[PDB]
């Protein structure tokens, strides 16, 4: 955990930091204050504020850079003032800033520290990169020892080991003020924010963009890389994540990887998932798993009312029960709750699992089916209503069809379907296949519309429907498909050797062939959902895959990959010397 944030406003609270993501502010600290944690601090993005402190020495021996992105009094990167006690002999007398090579922006202020010394000996211009910044270092300690012979009149403390080393030099107008020497060849690396040791990307005192383990780099190692054998982008085995301004192989203590950077929490669009020890943020591809409390016993809320309903948006699984009572539907005026808007019931079109029960005794008159509970597949029944019921549908005068289009299971409980005098299709339903264990006696179906009256008007299941029955009218409202299934809709055949969107089958379910396959006639277009399972490529073929275009500039482990299409539209590779891409296979065919 190298990088930690720094205070904004200027007992003792400490951070064992390396890189300070903000300002280092040491204000009102005791004479007997142990500052061993400061010994690892090398970089300060903001400023250093050392005001009114009784400790005899400030030890920051690793501090090499103060970025000065944030500045104290809008003028300084280093502000050292009043670090002395008026009556007590205890006062700041030495600044251990030996390794302070530079201040990227901002100025320097070192005043009113009655016993602080050796500051007048230091060449601040060899530190302060900012040409137009101010340097105020007066009114400090007096009668102090001269800089030890080995420190040529420049030192941070009296000791032979603590002297100020000069790093700044005159830069040639080919360096842009970044050089390790005066010669035009002695220019700095593009990624140094400041000065040099030498020309290499490692020799920087501060990185302009990122620090990938010693070397200042613009980009943190890319997460995907084109694989020549696999003919596609693959996770790069050299990947590092952006934890602050540092490139990190692993994400720190409870930090989830997202996109390419180390993050504190997962975005709404993604979900936390472990894979190979690292916790990454995988995209959901639509809706992410959400858990809502619910109604019934144990819960605060009694019925799905106009106020509580909004707290079920994007909810895929309810950790409780659902109660649709007249009190919530028509609204309770005793505790000033308004009537429920029917268009607001469309928040359950996302619900897939109910841990407990689903009680529906009230429903809008223009809503003739439970079409909102379409995505509902399984009902747990951990908590049960009345005598031990999981599914309760009674006294619903204007319900024509059940509408539970994709329900496959009800783990535990009892069925209750009564007084829905307008309800049909439920007769044909094979409850033995839906409810686990014995359905003997624990099935309640009475006082609804009888089959005789359903058949007479034409209220019967589709011919494409199986022996198991149906949820309502049409091919879509089926429990099981006789032949094939489309998007839940029972179909005769998939579009195998004919049709606009071409398909393939898997467990009697039709799935469309990848957009890149060529529509084949008299034979299958694909034998899988893959861009590689095609019979023919409608555009180009990059190895096993049918592609929209040939790889051109896709980064590989060994550099950018450029390929051109064949006469047979196949992605053949460009010549090694084509740095921009190519028309054909020769060197004469290089692009530029």
């Amino acid at each position, epitope marked *: 955990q190298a990088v930690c944030p720094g205070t904004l406003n200027g007992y003792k609270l400490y951070e064992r930091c390396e890189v300070v993501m903000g300002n280092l502010e040491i204000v009102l600290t005791g004479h007997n204050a142990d500052l061993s944690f400061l010994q690892w601090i090398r970089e300060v993005t903001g400023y250093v504020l050392v005001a009114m402190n009784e400790f005899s020495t400030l030890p920051l021996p690793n501090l090499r850079v103060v970025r000065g992105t944030q500045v104290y009094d809008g003028k300084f990167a280093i502000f050292v003032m009043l670090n002395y006690n008026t009556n007590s002999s205890h006062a700041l007398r030495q600044l251990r800033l030996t390794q302070l090579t530079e201040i990227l922006s901002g100025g320097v202020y070192i005043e009113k520290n009655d016993k602080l010394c050796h500051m007048d000996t230091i060449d601040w211009r060899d530190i302060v990169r900012d040409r137009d910044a101010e340097i105020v270092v007066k009114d400090n300690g007096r009668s102090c020892p001269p800089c030890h012979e080995v420190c040529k009149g420049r030192c941070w403390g009296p000791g032979s080991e603590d002297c100020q080393t000069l790093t700044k030099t005159i830069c040639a107008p080919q360096c842009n003020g970044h050089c390790f020497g005066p010669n035009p060849n002695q220019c700095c690396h593009d990624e140094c924010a400041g000065g040099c040791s030498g020309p290499q990307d490692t020799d920087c005192f501060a990185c302009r963009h990122f620090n990938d383990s010693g070397a200042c780099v613009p980009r943190c190692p890319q997460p995907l890389v084109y*694989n020549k054998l696999t003919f596609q982008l693959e*996770p790069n*085995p050299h990947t590092k994540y952006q934890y602050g301004g540092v490139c990190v192989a692993s994400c720190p203590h409870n930090f989830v990887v997202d996109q390419t950077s180390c993050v504190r929490a997962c975005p709404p669009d993604k979900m936390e998932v472990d894979k190979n020890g690292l916790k990454m943020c995988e995209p959901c591809g639509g809706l992410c798993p959400k858990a809502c409390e619910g109604t019934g016993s144990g819960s605060r809320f009694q019925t799905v009312d106009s106020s509580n309903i909004d707290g079920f948006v994007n909810c895929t699984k309810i950790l409780g029960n659902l109660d649709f009572l007249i009190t919530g539907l028509n609204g309770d005026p005793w505790h000033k709750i308004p009537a429920l808007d029917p268009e607001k019931l469309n928040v359950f079109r996302t619900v897939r699992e109910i841990t407990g029960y689903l009680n529906i005794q009230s429903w809008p008159p223009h809503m003739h089916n439970f079409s909102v509970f379409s995505n509902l597949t399984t009902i747990g029944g951990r908590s049960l209503y009345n005598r031990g019921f999981s599914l309760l549908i009674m006294k619903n005068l204007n319900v024509t069809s059940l509408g539970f289009r994709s329900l496959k299971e009800i783990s535990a409980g009892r069925i209750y379907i009564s007084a829905n005098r307008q309800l049909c299709y439920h007769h044909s339903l094979n409850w033995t296949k839906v409810l686990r264990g014995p359905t003997e006696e624990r099935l309640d179906i009475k006082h609804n519309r009888p089959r005789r009256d359903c058949v007479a008007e034409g209220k019967v299941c589709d011919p494409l429907c199986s022996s198991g029955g149906c949820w309502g009218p049409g091919p879509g409202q089926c429990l099981s498909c006789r032949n094939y299934s489309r998007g839940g809709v029972c179909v005769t055949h998939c579009n195998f050797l004919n049709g606009e969107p071409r398909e393939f089958a898997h467990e009697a379910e039709c799935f469309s062939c990848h957009p890149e396959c060529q529509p084949m006639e008299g034979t299958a277009t694909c034998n899988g959902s*893959g861009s590689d399972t095609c019979a023919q490529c409608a555009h180009f073929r990059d*190895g096993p895959h049918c592609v929209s275009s040939c790889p051109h500039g896709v980064l590989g482990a060994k550099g950018p990959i450029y390929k051109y299409p064949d006469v047979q539209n196949e992605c*053949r590779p460009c010549h090694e010397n084509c740095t921009q891409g190519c028309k054909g296979p020769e060197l004469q065919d290089c692009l530029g």
Partner: antibody
Amino acid sequence: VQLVESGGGLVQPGGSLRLSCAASGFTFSSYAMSWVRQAPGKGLEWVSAINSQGKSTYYADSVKGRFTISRDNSKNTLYLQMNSLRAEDTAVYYCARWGDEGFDIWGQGTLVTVSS
Amino acid sequence: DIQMTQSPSSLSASVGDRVTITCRASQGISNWLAWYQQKPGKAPKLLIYGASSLQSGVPSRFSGSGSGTDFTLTISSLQPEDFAVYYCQQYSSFPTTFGQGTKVEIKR
């Protein structure tokens, strides 16, 4: 950095065999892997490849519909589930790693012998 | 598919001689060729990737060359150790294909 094959013995024709390649000394999880077979005493023949994640698997035509490539990135092992084994499948089966370019690291190879 | 045809199949040369191996690919392959060494009863060892690019810690005597179809593997000064069968590998096309090998042995 090493790979260790296992399971390559003797199967009767029409038989079944699950080969196993134990990866060590590297992040197995991060590299696309392959099986390469060598019938005595002939040349090299790429037999199957697998995606780093394992989402995408590719088989050479000779082996398709019979062998199945897989990997358990937790157990740090790779597998080749060869089915309906033909005599023509007797080979030494090398499990190799696709590096940044080329098969950089290879196992010792296990010898499968299809015989009655 | 791309057929890889190596030449010669067997090669005999004295220790110190400049040994050359060729490789022609049925179709265009750029510089996407790998060279392997296979000493008896051992797994192949990757010598050259790219087509001229040398693998880490492979003796400097080994060198590669070429682009598109015709390729060359060269051993600057043939060594006793160098006895093995050498393979080709195109990785520009699916399936990846190898050569038949060039059995290089010492004339002593």
